[PDB]
Design an enzyme around this catalytic site. Structure first.
Site, PDB file in Angstrom:
ATOM      1  N   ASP A  37      30.928  27.512  41.417  1.00 14.79           N
ATOM      2  CA  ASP A  37      31.342  28.830  42.604  1.00 14.79           C
ATOM      3  C   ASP A  37      32.737  28.111  42.041  1.00 14.79           C
ATOM      4  O   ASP A  37      33.458  28.444  42.047  1.00 14.79           O
ATOM      5  CB  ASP A  37      30.857  29.647  43.959  1.00 14.79           C
TER       6      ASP A  37
ATOM      7  N   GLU B   2      28.727  42.215  48.100  1.00 12.56           N
ATOM      8  CA  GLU B   2      28.871  42.555  46.904  1.00 12.56           C
ATOM      9  C   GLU B   2      27.997  44.542  46.788  1.00 12.56           C
ATOM     10  O   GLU B   2      26.507  44.450  46.870  1.00 12.56           O
ATOM     11  CB  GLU B   2      28.389  41.684  45.503  1.00 12.56           C
TER      12      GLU B   2
ATOM     13  N   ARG C  45      23.935  44.055  48.715  1.00 14.03           N
ATOM     14  CA  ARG C  45      23.848  42.998  48.910  1.00 14.03           C
ATOM     15  C   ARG C  45      23.960  42.761  51.049  1.00 14.03           C
ATOM     16  O   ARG C  45      24.582  42.900  51.453  1.00 14.03           O
ATOM     17  CB  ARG C  45      23.755  41.697  48.521  1.00 14.03           C
TER      18      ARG C  45
ATOM     19  N   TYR D  62      22.059  37.751  39.302  1.00 14.00           N
ATOM     20  CA  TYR D  62      23.079  38.145  38.866  1.00 14.00           C
ATOM     21  C   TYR D  62      22.824  39.467  37.299  1.00 14.00           C
ATOM     22  O   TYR D  62      22.047  38.882  36.244  1.00 14.00           O
ATOM     23  CB  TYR D  62      25.025  37.909  38.582  1.00 14.00           C
TER      24      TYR D  62
END
Ligand SMILES: CC(=O)N[C@H]1[C@H]([C@H](O)[C@H](O)CO)O[C@@](OC[C@H]2O[C@@H](O)[C@H](O)[C@@H](O)[C@H]2O)(C(=O)O)C[C@@H]1O
Length: 659
Positions: A233, A502, A518, A613
């Site tokens: 990230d 999310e 989430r 994801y």
């Protein structure tokens, strides 16, 4: 160059096949390449595609094999008993298990090269790993090899690691074939499920965070993070890349860089996967990350992404400063000139930079793509490249001049080091895009912007309200526009704990929407609004998903066709307490009372295969498109892997399973 042995259609159920007569002492140099096209009938257990060994008592650590695990890892061992050399080279998430309840044919390969002292492994057109090892062993280096077998390794007179499946074609070569040859030899139908691939037109070796969306006109659109310095990230360089299909997902355009800074060159980097080395990061380039797409009523398309200045991480960024000032009731992005302590400047009308102390225009201006001009001429900075020199990371000024940008570490005027949100619009369904617009400070002047929930936004049907999901770390933030996207507001909803929330929306009936998200407690939460998102219920939780506390992003969409006479939603998520694995697609039927009957599910691959994801879309022919991270993107063991975000399709009948 021709094989020393080629065999076809060898079906096995754990017992293997002796091919000693047909391989004995044929590996003259000791190098080898073995190319294996196979499918597994069962994924359980550690399974060897072939084994070359000393089978005598006491020599059980003298062998070479290529193996498969039940989580899709591909590896090889090369071991010698009396030298006590034990080589194991592998990569997680290299092969596929099953697809729509049929075993998947994969083509894999190993190359051992004595001059380079490397082992290389290939799966479905990708070189998944090449590793140099000091204790390198070729076939001649292992003492008393006497048994060569398909589908097992003969150890002390017993078959170990028995393969279950069919070796559709296996070729043994007694030399190290070159990389391009072996890539081609392993290319098959699985290879064509990658839209984005390492060092394609993005320049990136790595990708995460896929998004699919089907436009009103039939075009199927994708966006994704192109992450250059491994899959981290932060700190990293990330661009948003896009690709689209006008034939219901059969063929895709070469990827384009759609949101991208140029402070750092978008280059293919070999990020280390060793313990320790894998934690390496670059110093950080200006970044776009985590995209969201929505198509407006008028067919204009919006794409949103988070924006991070170079060197700034989600975790260390300031939470107490929006990066904006309010002057005469207007919100202007503020700037700090190098050597100042305070933010003494603002970007006002026509991008003119004002000195706020004097309230007068300066010689400086900022264009719509954030580039800085002085007296109408662009200022420039030198671009950075990253490289590897003796397994050492180097960053250097690379001779390319680019526009100075307020998001760069070398800028004369700099934005607050915090996160922002930008959006761009397209009037030709993704072929061209506007300049970015930074969201105003909708959370307040003294809070950072929200973080987007990757996936899509929606348009609620009764009011035409546009809704874009985001989160803050302790609240949900539902970003919305009631004027067809001219201006933006937010509803902030406090959460029971510090969820990385999310989210994605569905509309159950006119005015009634749910946000699925989430959490940090192992469950998927959903909040309900009966007034098109103005007010929200307390959380409820899905009863059938149980995940680890860190959780994962999900995808949920409305589906246009009735299923069992009912309106339906389609959910994609991992479902496992042991990692980001056991991907499932769930069909939920909307009851008359606006509750959901979660009636069917389909496991995407075997349960121990990775699934992180994901993104769903309904294709124009009413099939379902899925793109997903086919690996565990949280695990520290599965970082920085190439070619692991595939696209696959399902008919509803493929999904209507398990009740
Ligand atoms: C690919 C791989 O992991 N190979 C290992 C192998 C497998 O882990 C195992 O056979 C699968 O069940 O195991 C090897 O180790 C044997 C060793 O395992 C320890 O955990 C145990 O404490 C010991 O008693 C002994 O069984 C093997 O030689 O089979 C190592 C090999 O690299």
């Amino acid at each position: 160059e021709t094989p020393v042995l080629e065999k076809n259609n060898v079906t096995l159920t754990g017992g293997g096949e002796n091919v000693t007569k047909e391989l004995k002492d044929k590996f003259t140099s000791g190098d080898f390449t073995v190319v294996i096209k196979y499918n597994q009938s069962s994924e359980k257990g550690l399974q060897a595609l072939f084994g070359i060994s000393n089978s005598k008592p006491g020599q059980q650590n003298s062998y070479v094999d290529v193996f498969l695990r039940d989580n899709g890892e591909l590896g090889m061992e090369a071991r010698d008993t009396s030298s006590n050399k034990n080589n194991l080279v592998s990569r997680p998430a290299s092969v596929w298990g099953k697809y729509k309840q049929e075993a998947v044919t994969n083509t894999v390969a190993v190359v051992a090269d004595s001059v380079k002292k490397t082992y290389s492994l290939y799966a479905n057109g990708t070189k998944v790993v090449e590793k140099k090892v000091d204790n390198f062993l070729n076939i001649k280096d292992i003492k008393g090899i006497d048994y060569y077998m398909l589908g097992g390794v003969k150890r002390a007179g017993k078959t170990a690691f028995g393969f279950n499946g069919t070796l559709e074609n296996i070729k043994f070569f007694n030399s190290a074939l070159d990389e391009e040859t072996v890539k081609k030899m392993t290319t098959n139908a699985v290879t064509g499920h990658l839209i984005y691939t390492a060092n394609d037109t993005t320049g990136s070796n790595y990708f995460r965070i896929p998004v699919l969306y089907t436009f009103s006109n039939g075009r199927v659109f994708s966006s994704i993070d192109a992450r250059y310095g491994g899959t981290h990230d932060f700190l990293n360089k990330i661009n948003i890349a896009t690709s689209y299909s006008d034939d219901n997902g059969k063929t895709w355009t070469k990827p384009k860089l759609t949101l991208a800074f140029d402070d750092f060159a978008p280059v293919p980097l070999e990020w280390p996967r060793e313990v320790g080395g894998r934690d390496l990061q670059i110093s950080g380039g200006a970044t776009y990350i985590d995209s969201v797409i929505v198509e407006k009523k008028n067919k204009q398309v919006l794409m949103f992404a988070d924006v991070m200045p170079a060197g700034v991480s989600f975790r260390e960024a300031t939470r107490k400063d929006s990066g904006y000032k309010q002057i005469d009731g207007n919100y202007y992005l503020k700037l700090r000139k190098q050597g100042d302590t305070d933010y003494n400047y603002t970007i006002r009308e026509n991008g003119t930079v004002y000195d706020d102390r004097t309230n007068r225009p300066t010689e400086f201006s900022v264009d719509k793509n954030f580039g800085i001009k002085q007296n109408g001429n662009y200022l420039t900075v030198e671009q950075y490249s990253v490289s590897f020199e003796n397994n050492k990371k180097t960053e250097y000024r690379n001779g390319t001049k680019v526009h100075m940008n307020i998001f760069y570490k070398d800028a004369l005027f700099k934005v607050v080091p915090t996160n922002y949100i930008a959006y761009i619009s397209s009037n030709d369904h993704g072929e061209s895009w506007s300049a970015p617009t930074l969201l105003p400070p909708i959370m307040g002047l003294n809070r950072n912007a929200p973080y987007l929930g990757p996936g899509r936004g929606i348009i609620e049907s009764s009011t035409g309200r546009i809704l874009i999901p985001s989160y803050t770390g302790k609240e949900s933030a539902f970003i919305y526009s009631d004027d067809n996207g001219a201006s933006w507001k937010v509803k902030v909803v406090p959460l029971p704990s510090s969820w990385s929330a999310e989210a994605q929306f569905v509309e159950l009936s006119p005015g009634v929407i749910q946000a699925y998200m989430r959490t940090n407690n192992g469950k998927i939460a959903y909040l309900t609004s009966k007034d098109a998102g103005t007010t929200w219920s307390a959380p409820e939780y899905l009863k059938f998903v149980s995940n680890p506390s860190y959780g994962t992003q999900l995808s949920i969409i409305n589906y246009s066709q009735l299923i069992d006479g009912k309106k339906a939603v389609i959910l994609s998520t991992p479902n496992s307490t042991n990692g980001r694995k056991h991907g499932q697609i769930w069909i939920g039927l909307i009851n008359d009372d606006n509750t959901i009957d979660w009636r069917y599910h389909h496991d995407v691959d075997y349960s121990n295969y990775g699934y992180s994801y994901s993104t769903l879309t309904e294709l124009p022919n009413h099939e379902i498109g899925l793109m997903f991270e086919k690996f565990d993107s949280w695990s520290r063991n599965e970082l920085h892997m190439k070619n692991v975000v595939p696209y696959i399709t399902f008919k509803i009948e493929d999904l209507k399973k398990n009740l």
